[PDB]
Every structure is written in structure tokens, then in C-alpha cells.
Design a protein that fits this description.
The structure is a homodimer. Chain A has five helices and seven strands. The first copy, chain A, is of the alpha/beta class. Chain A has a single domain, classed as CBS-domain (Roll), CATH 3.10.580. Chain A has a four-stranded mixed sheet. A three-stranded mixed sheet of chain A has the order 5-6-7. In chain A, helix 4 links the parallel strand 5 and strand 6. The radius of gyration of chain A is 17 Å and the shape is elongated. At the A-B interface, helix 1, helix 2, helix 3, helix 4 and helix 5 of A face helix 1, helix 2, helix 3, helix 4 and helix 5 of B. The complex binds phosphoaminophosphonic acid-adenylate ester (2 copies) and magnesium ion (MG) (2 copies). One phosphoaminophosphonic acid-adenylate ester (ANP) sits at the interface of chains A and B. The PDB classes it as transcription. Keywords: CBS domain dimer, Metabolism regulator, Central glycolytic gene regulator, transcription. It forms a dimeric assembly. Crystal Structure of the CBS domains from the Bacillus subtilis CcpN repressor complexed with AppNp, phosphate and magnesium ions.
Chain lengths: 145, 146
């Protein structure tokens, strides 16, 4: 069954990703909390003026910010975001099984899927524990290959 | 079934919650919203289950429930969590002997991250575990190891 596991490890991010939710690094913390409710997501990807990834924000980053303090309306997200270069990213060509291992091992809910352009990391997707959950359901209904 | 993938499917469909749950994190319903946000960080979970005096489930709190409370234009951080929690009877729960893939479908269909695993008692549901999308991710990882 090593061969079966092998074939599973060849499934790629492009076929199982979700749209990215992105915010500009100068948007306020209040604005980022709004986007996360309007978009109903749990992780936000922060980009610069040239649309290049610079940061991520999670719910707890925002909840940490929201006690107290600290004028959420006046505070730019770049002040609190988790910053590049310490963001775990993937590309559409990566194998979802490797990306599941990063979500686990890095203890995070989502990766940005980026494309390496002649500008930097442009954000083109997200892959989360929801996408993983769905792939697992699909496997159990023999709906993949 | 007749292919390796069908055999895969067949196993997946027989996994039970009791073998793939995590420890539950529970708070009393009189704890303040600030205290619940403290617990969430202290315990490193994204969903807290709320119980009453008799350790029976009465509610759940998610990260966004607490974020909404902390930034809303009413002062809600000082209030008891029972003011803001999602309340019974409208909690999706599971039991130890439920099938994991049935739970994964509810997580997806109901767009929530976690269910409490409960046991029925004569006073109501006792919280005895949690199953979340993190659990499901770990099962997916094990497939490529095993
Ligand atoms: N892809 C990522 N790469 C690097 N850091 C990340 C990434 N995703 C989130 N983070 C940071 O990692 C921390 C954990 O985020 P995440 O876990 O996804 O959400 P959380 O709401 O903060 N809690 P949790 O689910 O318990 O880990 C936060 O400080 C994030 O900003
Ligand atoms: N098991 C459950 N049964 C009923 N409601 C739940 C359950 N788990 C969470 N909820 C509620 O459903 C809403 C969405 O929860 P959940 O999704 O888990 O987290 P959020 O951080 O609020 N993010 P999201 O994953 O994007 O909807 C919140 O009001 C929760 O209180
Ligand atoms: Mg997150
Ligand atoms: Mg949450």
C-alpha cells in the first residue's frame, strides 16, 4: 500500500484551493476585523501597494489587538501582522499532503497560495483545514483521482 | 470495494470519533468574556464549550464570537459568556461512536470548525472531547504516512 500513499502524495494544491482574502498593509485593525466578518474567513493575507504578500493576520492576532488598547481605528495592520519572511506559503504545484503536514507542524489554519512573479509573491489562493477536511470527505466517498 | 481507493474509502468510513478526538476545553457560563478570551489563548483552542453548574453543555464560543464581543460598540468584555454564546438547543454535537466522516460532513455543511463530543446523562450532555478540522487534517496526513 506504499504505492497508494504515493499516489495520494501527488495530489496538488491547484485542484483543492480556495480564493484568497487580501487586505492592503495600511488598512486599520478595525478595517481588517470588518473584512474578516464580511468575507467570513479566519485568516487574512496582507499585501503591499504592488500586491505582493507582506503579512498574514489570524483571528487571534485581531483579538489580541482588540484588547484593548490601542486605537483600532488608527492602527495600521502592518503593526500587528505576522510578517514576511516568516510566512509559510505554497504554490499551486505543491502537493496537498505536504501542505497538510505544514498546517499541522506549523500549527496554523491556512497557507496563502502564491505565484512567483517578476514582482514577488503575488497571492492567488488560500489552502486551509477546511480544504483538507473536504479532501478527506471526498476520499471517503471515493470521489477522487 | 474493488480498487485501492475504494478500500481507502471503506476504512475512512469506519473511523469513529472516540479514536480521533482531542481534549475538550470547557468554561463556566458565568465566566466573563475577557476570561474566555484569556482561556482561548491559555489553552490554544479556537472553540470553547460552555457548561452550567452541573457541567452540562449550554453553549459554544468561537474566536469570532469573542472578537465580535470585544470590538462591538457595546461594552461586552465584562459580561458573562452566557450573554454572547451560541445556545442550546442549536449546538451540533457528536458522540464517541459516531463515524468521523459523518462529523466532517457536518463541519463542512454547517460551516463550523468544531463539535463537542458528549455523552448523554440524565441532566443533559456532558462534554467529553472535541473534534475539529485539525483532527481531520491529521487523519489526512496519516494516510500519506500509513
Ligand atoms: N501561513 C502562515 N504562515 C506563517 N504564519 C502564519 C500563517 N498563518 C497564520 N500565521 C500566524 O500564526 C499564528 C497562528 O495562526 P492560526 O493558528 O492560523 O490562527 P489563530 O487564530 O491565531 N490560532 P490557532 O488555530 O490556535 O493556531 C498567528 O500569529 C498568525 O498570524
Ligand atoms: N458545534 C457547533 N454547533 C453550533 N454552532 C457552533 C458550533 N461550533 C461553532 N458554532 C457557532 O457557529 C459560528 C461560526 O463558528 P466557527 O466557524 O467555528 O468559528 P468563527 O471563528 O466564528 N469562524 P468560521 O470558521 O469562518 O464561521 C459561531 O457563532 C459559533 O458560536
Ligand atoms: Mg487562522
Ligand atoms: Mg474560531
Amino acid at each position: 500500500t506504499q504505492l497508494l500513499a504515493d499516489k495520494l502524495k501527488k495530489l496538488q494544491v491547484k485542484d483543492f484551493q480556495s480564493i484568497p482574502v487580501v487586505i492592503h498593509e495600511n488598512v486599520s485593525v478595525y478595517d481588517a476585523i470588518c473584512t474578516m466578518f464580511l468575507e467570513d474567513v479566519g485568516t487574512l493575507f496582507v499585501v503591499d501597494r504592488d500586491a505582493v504578500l507582506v503579512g498574514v493576520l489570524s483571528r487571534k492576532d485581531l483579538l489580541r489587538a482588540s484588547i484593548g488598547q490601542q486605537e483600532l481605528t488608527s492602527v495600521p495592520v502592518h503593526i500587528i501582522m505576522t510578517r514576511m519572511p516568516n510566512i509559510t506559503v505554497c504554490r499551486r504545484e505543491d502537493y496537498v499532503m505536504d501542505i497538510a503536514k505544514h498546517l499541522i507542524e506549523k500549527q496554523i489554519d491556512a497557507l496563502p497560495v502564491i505565484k512567483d512573479t517578476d514582482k514577488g509573491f503575488e497571492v492567488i489562493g488560500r489552502v486551509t483545514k477546511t480544504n483538507m477536511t473536504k479532501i478527506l470527505v471526498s476520499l471517503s466517498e471515493n470521489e477522487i483521482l
